[PDB]
Symmetry: C6
Subunit: 173 residues, 6 copies
Amino acid sequence: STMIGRILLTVVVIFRILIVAIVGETVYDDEQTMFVCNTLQPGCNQACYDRAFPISHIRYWVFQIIMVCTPSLCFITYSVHQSAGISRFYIIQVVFRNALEIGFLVGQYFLYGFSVPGLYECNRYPCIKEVECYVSRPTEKTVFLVFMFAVSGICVVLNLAELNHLGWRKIKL
Amino acid sequence: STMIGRILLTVVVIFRILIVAIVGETVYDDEQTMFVCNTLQPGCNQACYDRAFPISHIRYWVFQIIMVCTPSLCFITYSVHQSAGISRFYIIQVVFRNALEIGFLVGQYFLYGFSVPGLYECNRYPCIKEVECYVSRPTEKTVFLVFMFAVSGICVVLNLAELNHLGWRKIKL
Amino acid sequence: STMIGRILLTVVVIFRILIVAIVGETVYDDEQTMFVCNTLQPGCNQACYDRAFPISHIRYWVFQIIMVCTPSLCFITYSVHQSAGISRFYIIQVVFRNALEIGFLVGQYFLYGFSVPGLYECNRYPCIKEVECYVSRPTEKTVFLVFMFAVSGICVVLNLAELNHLGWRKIKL
Amino acid sequence: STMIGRILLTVVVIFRILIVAIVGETVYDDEQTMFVCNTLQPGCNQACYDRAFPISHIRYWVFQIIMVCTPSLCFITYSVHQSAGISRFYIIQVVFRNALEIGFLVGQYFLYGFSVPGLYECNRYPCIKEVECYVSRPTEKTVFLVFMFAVSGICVVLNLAELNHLGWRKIKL
Amino acid sequence: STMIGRILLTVVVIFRILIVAIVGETVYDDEQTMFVCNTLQPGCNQACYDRAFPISHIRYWVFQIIMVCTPSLCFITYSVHQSAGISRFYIIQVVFRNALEIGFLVGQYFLYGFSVPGLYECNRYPCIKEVECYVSRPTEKTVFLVFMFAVSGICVVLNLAELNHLGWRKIKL
Amino acid sequence: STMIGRILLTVVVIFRILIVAIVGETVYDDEQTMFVCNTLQPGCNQACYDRAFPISHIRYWVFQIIMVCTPSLCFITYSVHQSAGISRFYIIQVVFRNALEIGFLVGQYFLYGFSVPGLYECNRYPCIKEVECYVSRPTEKTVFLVFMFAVSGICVVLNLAELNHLGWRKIKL
Ligand SMILES: C=C[C@H]1CN2CC[C@H]1C[C@H]2[C@H](O)c1ccnc2ccc(OC)cc12
Ligand SMILES: C=C[C@H]1CN2CC[C@H]1C[C@H]2[C@H](O)c1ccnc2ccc(OC)cc12
Ligand SMILES: C=C[C@H]1CN2CC[C@H]1C[C@H]2[C@H](O)c1ccnc2ccc(OC)cc12
Ligand SMILES: C=C[C@H]1CN2CC[C@H]1C[C@H]2[C@H](O)c1ccnc2ccc(OC)cc12
Ligand SMILES: C=C[C@H]1CN2CC[C@H]1C[C@H]2[C@H](O)c1ccnc2ccc(OC)cc12
Ligand SMILES: C=C[C@H]1CN2CC[C@H]1C[C@H]2[C@H](O)c1ccnc2ccc(OC)cc12
């Protein structure tokens, strides 16, 4: 069943790209404009927001998508160069895709967790002692995070199935 | 009369996609900017808005459109792969489309109801006791909700007619 | 003279589509941010704006354009399906186009009238008794309304001429 | 010298379209946001701005461009319809283009004049007695107005030269 | 060495167009929003900004680019008209391009100078006596100005080299 | 191994272009709007921001990308001109690309360093003595800076490998 696997993998990849490109930028538009802290100190909002969200989810997902698509670009460009052999590059391409997908999934888990809390406790200079800050659209961001995790997991499973179908002797050489 | 059914189904799908893509993003632009609560507590606006609208309508409809279109993409990609049999995949594609459409319609009803009230009563921390908040463009959003429900219902009816035409005997095999 | 009629109909349809798509969105961009009421009550602006303009003109016109273009799309897709008879679908398409155009024109008149006043008197909760609110760019919106009415009337007249050319005898059968 | 006339006319038309489409919308973006009146009365800004600028320049120019291009569209669509005679439609097209261009130029002069003053004196309700309001980017708007007038005048002269070349004898028949 | 000249000229023209189109509009986005004067008089900001920057740099550069490209458009359209002689049009086009480039460079120098100061002294009505105003991103605008001047100078030198290569006897005839 | 080098070089170039074009403009959107200084002096924010960030990172990277791509454009245009010899232009193109890449990398290091601090001490007129200002999203900008440096270094290494492969003897002649 190596064919249905490829069909599903292509469909899932396209689905993820479309969803991100269409909704992600709009969801995270006012992330910093609607972030508010209970204080009068100038500059506390900037510091607390930067501590709460070092990297936005949307940029991480864009980077992940491009990086995961890169090996296919390598293979296609190699094929173009060859004309005006290819049965070996394919195995290495598959292995690299598997490694990249797994690494990105693990990194997402270790960076963001599984939910976006509605409150944040911040104690960065210049804020005096510890202050409380309030996040914008926590529930939508939680839903987006869980959905992206599920899609990435499906992709990982399909890639592992493909790699197993090839056989580890192909991967060895 | 299986041909007029397909014609109407295609026309309705295109109509829904066009309407959403052209007007939806503009209707819901200032959903959070124009949401106001009668209070002085910092952070009450964020909490009350997040409780009132956990997920925006437009994002739900975009997700629904992509998911409903997915099975046709699966079928087209399978057909492409086959060349450089297909009479069985079509039945499963139809069944999956029917199930997805019905599920999305039911989910929309259970999530949003049939109207958007102009007032909201919010009792989420940090708001003190219970406060009153006011929504932006409730009437336009109600009209949009009802129109989308009607279009989805028409799609469901056409899909059921198609599935009935194919037949239960054929579906079983 | 059934040819010049078709030429003019196509030209006016394209003209209307272009004008709307190019200027309408920009005209109605700040409709709600520049709407102000003389009061101190929170939430009175939202209620009064929603009562004054239940549906924006631009969205009504977009819906009208798509709906009016739908029958031609149905005819085209039926023609595509036929290859890989058509002289009867054409009459029904013409009749449906006539009905839709007339209905949309009448609806526009009954919804918006012929002018956009510069003042509004609002007595919706939470506003206390009666308040006075001030509209943004009333004159430009009045000009746009009248222009759209005139274009739609021209389209209706051309469609009626076409339908008369076809003849009642043919329409009946 | 009927050929260089056509070459110059085409080049000028393209030049005008490009200039408008590229810069006009950006010039007039903050026309109402940066318009300020010296008063405390709510709603005086809206009334005074609407009285000072009933129709924005950019929208008038867009309408003019589309209307002037319409007759060529009529001719092209007629030519397409003819295949799957034309030496007479051309003369009427030229005459209509001349009339439209002259009318639009005269209308622009009678609507806007030749300059945009930096101050405005406004006595519209609800403003008390007479107030003073201040315009945004008067000099750039004056330059744009004069440039558009010059380009339209060049177009009118070229069209008149073409019409004279065709001849009154031919035009009458 | 008439070929490398043409190659470099084409490359430089494309480079200038790309740089402007990509960064210019973003650099000058908040030119008026971030312009502030030290006063309490309503309307002083508008007058002082209009006096300081009668025409934005970006619009001047867009106009220059279109005007400089115009003669090539004239030549191409003439060539198209000729088919369904040309060795004399080309020299006239070269001369016109040289004149336009030199004129635009001189005009830029006389209009803007070589730097954008960070302070402005403004004494325009309604400002009382003389006030001080502060500009936004003076350094980036200075860098952009110098870069555009250098690119235009390179273009002028290449055009002069081409014209000299053609020879004076040939331009006279 | 001169083919895999070219494959990797093309892939990394495309990757860098995509990442910049997609995320850079959004990261640096509110650079000046969210920059705040602890003072009451009008005009201190503008001066301090201009001193802290003379040129935005995104514009520098756009300029670098276009300049690095220029030599390939020159070579392609020369090839087009040649038809309707080339083995010597290629070496000079490679050398120029190497020089440009190295220069841009060194310039980036000397201009921006390796991190974006969260605080800035500013003593520019009109600010009184020293003031403290707070930056927006320092961590994301630091990550972007480091990532761009790494990608540029990889490109430099690949270019040096290519140049070494061609040979010093060949480069001399
Ligand atoms: C369909 C979405 C629209 C929004 N952005 C501008 C117009 C349209 C294209 C998209 C962007 O160019 C873009 C192009 C390609 N890939 C993208 C991937 C992600 C993205 O934002 C997360 C924007 C992307
Ligand atoms: C026609 C609408 C315009 C508004 N958005 C940017 C330019 C144009 C395209 C559209 C967006 O890229 C987009 C592309 C494709 N499908 C879409 C589907 C939905 C949507 O918003 C709900 C935006 C979509
Ligand atoms: C020409 C207008 C521009 C403004 N909008 C984005 C870029 C360009 C396209 C248009 C929009 O995508 C769009 C596409 C197609 N039909 C439309 C119809 C109506 C509309 O606004 C009323 C926007 C439309
Ligand atoms: C080149 C200009 C850009 C700005 N607008 C969106 C993207 C690009 C296209 C243009 C608009 O779609 C548009 C299309 C066609 N004709 C137009 C004519 C005028 C215009 O504004 C006055 C905008 C136009
Ligand atoms: C690549 C730049 C993007 C920004 N603007 C909208 C989308 C893209 C196109 C460009 C504009 O339509 C445009 C088109 C063509 N020539 C232009 C020249 C100059 C310009 O701004 C100075 C904008 C231009
Ligand atoms: C894919 C990104 C989207 C955002 N901008 C508008 C729509 C889409 C295109 C891009 C811009 O036109 C653009 C075109 C080409 N090269 C670019 C390079 C850089 C850039 O910003 C740093 C914007 C670029």
